[PDB]
Ligand binder design. Structure first.
Ligand SMILES: Nc1nc2c(ncn2[C@@H]2O[C@H](COP(=O)(O)OP(=O)(O)O)[C@@H](O)[C@H]2O)c(=O)[nH]1
Lengths: 36, 430, 607, 44, 186
């Protein structure tokens, strides 16, 4: 079996994990940037 | 309640019904898998008319598909909405009629008719209370024009009281696809006139003219022609399937449209028809609908109505509108066109209303008229027949399978008579 | 100046593949009614992309997280514009002008240099290629039949796929000659209709969906197809979206709303699940687990892989908010009318509280009742309905109140009566009683549809504003004394001043006009954009400031005593229609006709 | 009549695709069916 | 069910030509089978129940127990095809007194006995199709010397093909039977 990138896979891992918890609410902005 | 079964014979009828069922399923909210997903409750109150209920909540059309060759059913089985058709009803032959009415009606058709007769009989006992039967076929093909009308005679023998529709594609010399059209055409129509409660004539050249002129689309196809035919199909029985202020069924039409037992040949039409270039320019109102549905170019038939006088006519509107304005354009169009209506039958216009419009269009109308202009197809077909027949061309193939010259003579004489008494009332005065 | 916004409730699931998780993650992009929004995930920040005029139709992104392409649908007379936005700068990097009405699809190569755009059914299905660095139309292809989507191959960008309505087409593009070659994949006795497509990473095989519900499998090296899809079973509304796992497993979205996976074997589902609304977008996260799903009813779902259990992340409004209301002296909850179903929402946290659904009717002017009694609404058929707060069951219905639908409602404080307005100038009064509901209206005549009815504190006097151009003030005791206020335009919101004598009224003209029952005009404000129709207004308990909003995206609040604007509001899309202020007045809420909900922090120095 | 019904039977059973074809002779069918109208050539 | 409803001359409970011939009927099958086929002797679709252990295979008059099929009508009649196999059918009736009695008719029984709750009777079937008339009036008046008010239930057991079951209310002849009620000869 091929050897995956140890750092890359774990990076995707905790990235998706944190996105899970922080994805609960999308409404709040607190950084408007109407113009840009 | 008051159901009708749907049966196809010959590839033309199979192709018509194949997407007739598609249109019906779409307007009833039925998926290609037989599972209802409509949004309105009225979509489900009257579904037994065309669909039987099967275990698992699915629905199966009460249609019997029949032909003497398997290719067309093999194609339609994989066609869109082909999964709804139950595999049992597929009745197919093994040779093909060779476009020969003899092989289509005496040698092969007579022996093959037993299975389809059994199936249609069982289907007839299946429904609660029968309204009648309706056919979709072409007189120009051997297997259809022969064994379909054979089945017509058998079924009319066994159910004398029911009403029958026959939507028939007649041959025309403008678009002629076969060299032997007059023979089997006259042979089929001779038998069909004696048993047909109602006959709906459809002209493919007229279909090309319509799809060329009314819509301005570059390359129409058999699918588009089938779409127009299917719209005409659904317009007739919309009122029986949905509520309305003035409900009128097939027996209503039979009572109101046929003065005499031999005058049951009709020409039909559908409106509105608009281009994609002008649909949102054009403002659809009741006068616009009526002027379109009385237009000479909107008719599904090549015979021009202004060469004769209407014996009677009927119109079915679909969508929400009051009835008095409908009545007023009816009376106005009867008044300004009194020359084109027979004068000894006043009030020869039937009007019916249904409050459920078709999907995507808020108003629609279907027109069916018994007119004294139909004699043109019959005279030209008879002229072609005698042109072929005086030299006995293409005759040995028929006479080699039970045919003789006497049957052709009787059919020709009967058609000439039918023309004579059909045009006699045009000149009749009160 | 500009006013803060704290929360936004907006999403459009009408456009397919609208929801996109930006590669490298942390960024989630989706289209609003007419503007694109990007959101950082770990932080709570977001950014707006507003370089458009009409509703967005298509959103696409490149590989390796490079620039984004957005396309919108316009009127027949004009031409749709394709806008390329450079990422990491949030700047419009290019604008391109071609095609007649709308663009159906956009495709990016594996390399970022090239572009493909597909026009709508109008322009006769024109396929165009573009160059990213400089906008150039190298060559194009017109075809008769409609093509639903086009996709570039993962490698060998010279070969592209097009799911034409009749069947599949493979197109070859060469640099040597500007010509494009077309090969039609032939099917034996098959007339399936095809919408979505996906390509395996090896570029050997492509899986294409069907309107019937079975996914076909076709090699690119030949016009031969292999497999119809799930045997003996279908998905009952066609195939919405396709996705490919590294295993080759095919994640499929059904039209009814259904998520299932088929192994690269006999097409049998390993696991199946049910999801609300028609599926519209599927986005696979990095490492291909726990992907995002976007419905056609504006719902965002977090769907696990290999064990399909749907978990609802958040829900959004379906479309076209009609009006908003607060309870009397209560601000924790607020209710919104919808196209079909009324919703209630919490102000602090904007998760959905409760929905009351009606199949095929529009609501207008939902009115709350103190003492926690039923909520009242009016519908298209002309009926009025009252529903209980915790659970959506109706207390009562009033049938055939007005011929063409009730438009506006107002409640007296002591709540024994309701005043209602129809489209054809009819204003009616109904005596509610726990036993029965009766009416004693004057059946007073009033030409246009009435958009607003207000009742003063002492509850005897009640004003009603018509579309015709008259704001008539009714004594409500004798149903007489018809003195009505005159100006010539389409009226809108009218308000009493709290514990004064003045009427703050608006109309189609770009003017907020202070009036009195004696034709007394303090000032003619004239708050005008180029083609703005100021429509929504609100007043503080103390007459320091009033909030005003037009049809234009901008919304602004003005000092009552003196005609000078303080602060302003932007970031909206489309026509803003209603502006309310909470009883606690710590915020101002606005509802946009394109599905967006905005709550704004009112400035501190208006207390 | 007796036959002509059998041969028709195979066709409709064939119309079901299911990623399979029924020619009527697939599995556990005698030793083997003659490779042509005559028995096979020496080199296939 | 069938209470406070008109009846004058006839009342049909079951007939095999319809979309759902048996809706009020409840079917319980253990080793048998139920289906309707066109009959060779009479060219029409006929419902059929078949199986072994005739006791366990039956169809009940109500879909569920605990309520009545209240019928005031005196005369039962059935159209059954004689298949040269076992067959039983029973009827539950209410008398003058609020008592429930029952009459069973068996093909394979040879003795008749009266009992307070059950009255069994043998029956004989001629070859081929036949329609049989069940009086029930003289039957109750002879078995318990008590008149009848209402007939609660009807039950058919296995091994039979059935065309019509109805209430005829009096002895009628073929000529005065309407076309649907009469059996047209092959
Ligand atoms: N409207 C319509 N007409 C058709 C179609 N197929 C064939 N026809 C017409 O039918 C005629 C030939 O009929 P034919 O195929 O011989 O009928 P068959 O013998 O029953 O198969 C041609 O002139 C066609 O115009 C179809 O799909 N739609």
């Amino acid at each position: 079996l091929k050897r995956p990138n140890s750092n890359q896979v774990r990076n995707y891992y905790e990235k998706t994990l944190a996105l899970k918890i922080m994805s609960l609410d999308l409404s709040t902005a607190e950084q408007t940037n109407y113009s840009r | 309640m008051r159901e009708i079964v749907h049966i196809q014979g010959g590839q033309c009828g199979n192709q018509i019904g194949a997407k007739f069922w598609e249109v019906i399923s779409d307007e009833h909210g039925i998926d290609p898998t037989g599972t209802y997903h409509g949004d309105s409750d009225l979509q489900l109150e009257r579904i037994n008319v065309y669909y039987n209920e099967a275990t698992g909540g699915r629905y199966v059309p009460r249609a019997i598909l029949m032909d003497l060759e398997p290719g067309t059913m093999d194609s339609v089985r994989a066609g869109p909405f082909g999964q709804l058709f139950r595999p049992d009803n597929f009745v197919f032959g093994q040779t093909g009629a060779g476009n020969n009415w003899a092989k289509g009606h005496y040698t092969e058709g007579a022996e093959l008719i037993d299975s389809v007769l059994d199936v249609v009989r069982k289907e007839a006992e299946g429904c609660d209370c029968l309204q009648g039967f309706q056919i979709t076929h072409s007189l120009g093909g051997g297997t259809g024009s022969g064994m379909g009308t054979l089945l017509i005679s058998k079924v009319r023998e066994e159910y004398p009281d029911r009403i029958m529709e026959t939507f028939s594609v007649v041959p025309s010399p403008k678009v002629s696809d076969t060299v032997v059209e007059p023979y089997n055409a006259t042979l089929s129509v001779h038998q069909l006139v004696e048993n047909a409660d109602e006959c709906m004539v459809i002209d493919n050249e007229a279909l090309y003219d319509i799809c060329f002129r009314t819509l301005k689309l570059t390359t129409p196809t058999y699918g588009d022609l089938n779409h127009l035919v299917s719209a005409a199909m659904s317009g007739v029985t919309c009122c029986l399937r949905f509520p309305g202020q003035l409900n009128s069924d097939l027996r209503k039409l039979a009572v109101n449209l046929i003065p005499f037992p031999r005058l049951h040949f009709f020409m039909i039409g559908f409106a509105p028809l608009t281009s994609r270039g002008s649909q949102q320019y054009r403002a659809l109102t009741v006068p616009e609908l009526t002027q379109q549905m009385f237009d000479a170019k909107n008719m599904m038939c090549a015979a021009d109505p202004r060469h004769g006088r209407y014996l009677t006519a009927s119109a079915l509107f679909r969508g929400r509108m009051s009835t008095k304005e409908v009545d007023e354009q009816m009376l106005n169009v009867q008044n300004k066109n009194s020359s084109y209506f027979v004068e000894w039958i006043p009030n020869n216009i039937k009007s019916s209303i249904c409050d459920i419009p078709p999907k995507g269009l808020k108003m629609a109308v279907t027109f069916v008229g018994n007119s004294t202009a139909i004699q043109e197809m019959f005279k030209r077909v008879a002229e072609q027949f005698t042109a072929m027949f005086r030299r006995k061309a293409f005759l040995h193939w028929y006479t080699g399978e039970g045919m003789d010259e006497m049957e052709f003579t009787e059919a020709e004489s009967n058609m000439n008579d039918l023309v004579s008494e059909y045009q006699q009332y045009q000149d009749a005065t009160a | 100046k500009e006013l803060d916004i704290q929360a936004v409730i907006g999403f459009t699931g009408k456009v397919n593949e609208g929801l996109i998780l930006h590669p490298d993650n942390e960024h989630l992009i989706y289209p609003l009614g007419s503007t694109i929004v990007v959101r950082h995930i770990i932080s709570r920040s977001q950014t707006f992309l507003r370089g458009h005029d009409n509703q967005i139709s298509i959103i696409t992104v490149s590989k390796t997280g490079k620039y984004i392409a957005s396309g919108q649908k316009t009127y027949m007379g004009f031409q749709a514009d394709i806008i390329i936005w450079d990422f990491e700068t949030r700047s419009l990097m290019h604008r391109l002008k071609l095609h007649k009405v709308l663009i159906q699809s956009l495709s990016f190569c594996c390399n970022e240099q090239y572009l493909a755009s597909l026009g709508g059914q109008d322009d006769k299905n024109m396929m165009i290629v573009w160059d990213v660095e400089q906008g150039k139309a190298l060559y194009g292809a017109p075809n008769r039949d409609v093509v639903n989507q086009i996709k570039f191959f993962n490698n060998s960008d010279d070969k592209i796929i097009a799911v034409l309505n009749n069947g599949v087409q493979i197109l070859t593009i060469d640099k040597a000659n500007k010509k494009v070659k077309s090969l039609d994949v032939n099917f034996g006795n098959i007339k399936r209709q095809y919408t979505c497509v996906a390509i395996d990473p090896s570029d050997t095989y492509c899986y294409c969906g069907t309107k019937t519900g079975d996914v076909f499998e076709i090699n690119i090296e030949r016009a031969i197809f292999k497999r119809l899809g799930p045997v003996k079973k279908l998905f009952s509304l066609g195939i919405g979206t396709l996705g490919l796992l590294p295993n080759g497993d095919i994640i499929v979205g059904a039209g009814d709303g259904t998520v299932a996976k088929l192994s690269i074997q006999n097409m049998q589902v390993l696991s199946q699940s049910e999801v609300l609304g028609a599926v519209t977008s599927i986005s696979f996260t990095g490492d291909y687990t726990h992907f995002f799903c976007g419905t056609s009813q504006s719902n965002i779902y977090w769907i696990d892989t290999e064990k399909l259990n749907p978990e609802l992340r958040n829900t959004c409004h379906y479309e076209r908010i009609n009006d908003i209301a607060f309870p009397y002296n209560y601000s924790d909850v607020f209710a919104t009318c919808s196209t079909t179903d009324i919703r209630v929402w919490n102000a602090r946290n904007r998760q959905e509280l409760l929905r009351i659904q009606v199949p095929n009717l529009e609501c207008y002017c939902v009115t709350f009742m103190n003492d926690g009694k039923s909520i009242i609404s009016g519908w298209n058929d002309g009926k009025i309905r009252a529903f209980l707060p915790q659970s959506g069951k109706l207390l009562y219905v009033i049938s055939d109140a007005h011929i063409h639908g009730v438009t506006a409602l107002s409640t007296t404080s002591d709540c024994q009566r309701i005043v209602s307005g129809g489209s054809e100038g009819e204003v009616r009064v109904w005596v509610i009683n726990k036993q029965t509901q009766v009416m004693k209206a004057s059946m007073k005549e009033h030409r246009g549809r009435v958009w607003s009815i207000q009742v003063k504190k002492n509850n005897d006097q009640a004003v009603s504003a018509s579309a015709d151009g008259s704001c008539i003030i009714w004594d409500l005791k004798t149903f007489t004394r018809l003195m009505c206020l005159f100006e010539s335009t389409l009226f809108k919101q009218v308000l009493y001043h709290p514990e004064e004598s003045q009427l703050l009224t608006t109309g189609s003209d770009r003017k907020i006009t202070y009036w009195e029952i004696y034709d007394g005009q303090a000032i003619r404000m004239l708050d005008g954009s180029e083609e703005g129709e100021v429509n929504a207004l609100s007043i503080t308990k103390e007459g320091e400031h009033f909030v005003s909003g037009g049809e234009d995206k901008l919304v602004k609040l003005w000092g009552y005593d003196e005609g000078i604007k303080y602060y302003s509001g932007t970031g909206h899309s489309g026509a803003i229609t209603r502006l309310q202020i909470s009883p606690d007045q710590r915020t101002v809420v606005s509802v946009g006709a394109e599905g967006a909900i905005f709550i704004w922090k009112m400035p501190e120095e208006v207390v | 009549p007796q036959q002509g019904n059998t041969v028709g039977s195979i066709s409709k059973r064939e119309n079901v695709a299911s990623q399979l074809i029924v020619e009527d002779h697939l599995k556990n069918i005698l030793a083997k069916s003659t490779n042509s109208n005559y028995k096979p050539w020496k080199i296939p | 069910m069938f209470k406070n409803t008109f009846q004058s001359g006839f009342l049909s409970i079951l007939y095999s030509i319809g979309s759902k011939p048996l809706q009020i009927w409840d079917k319980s099958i253990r080793n048998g089978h139920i289906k309707r086929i066109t009959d060779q002797d009479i060219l029409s679709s006929v419902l059929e129940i078949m199986g072994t252990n005739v006791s366990t295979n039956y169809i009940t008059a109500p879909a569920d127990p605990k309520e009545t099929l209240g019928i005031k009508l005196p005369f039962l009649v059935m159209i059954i095809k004689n298949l040269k196999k076992y067959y039983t059918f029973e009827v539950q009736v209410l008398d003058d007194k609020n008592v429930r009695r029952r009459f069973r008719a068996s093909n394979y029984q040879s003795t008749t006995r009266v009992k307070p709750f059950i009255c069994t009777m043998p029956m004989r079937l001629d070859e081929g199709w036949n329609q049989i008339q069940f009086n029930l009036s003289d039957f109750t008046r002879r078995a318990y010397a008590t008149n009848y008010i209402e007939t609660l239930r009807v039950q058919i057991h296995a091994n039979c093909r059935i065309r019509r079951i109805y209430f005829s209310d009096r002895l009628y002849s073929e000529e005065e039977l309407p076309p649907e009620f009469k059996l047209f000869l092959p």
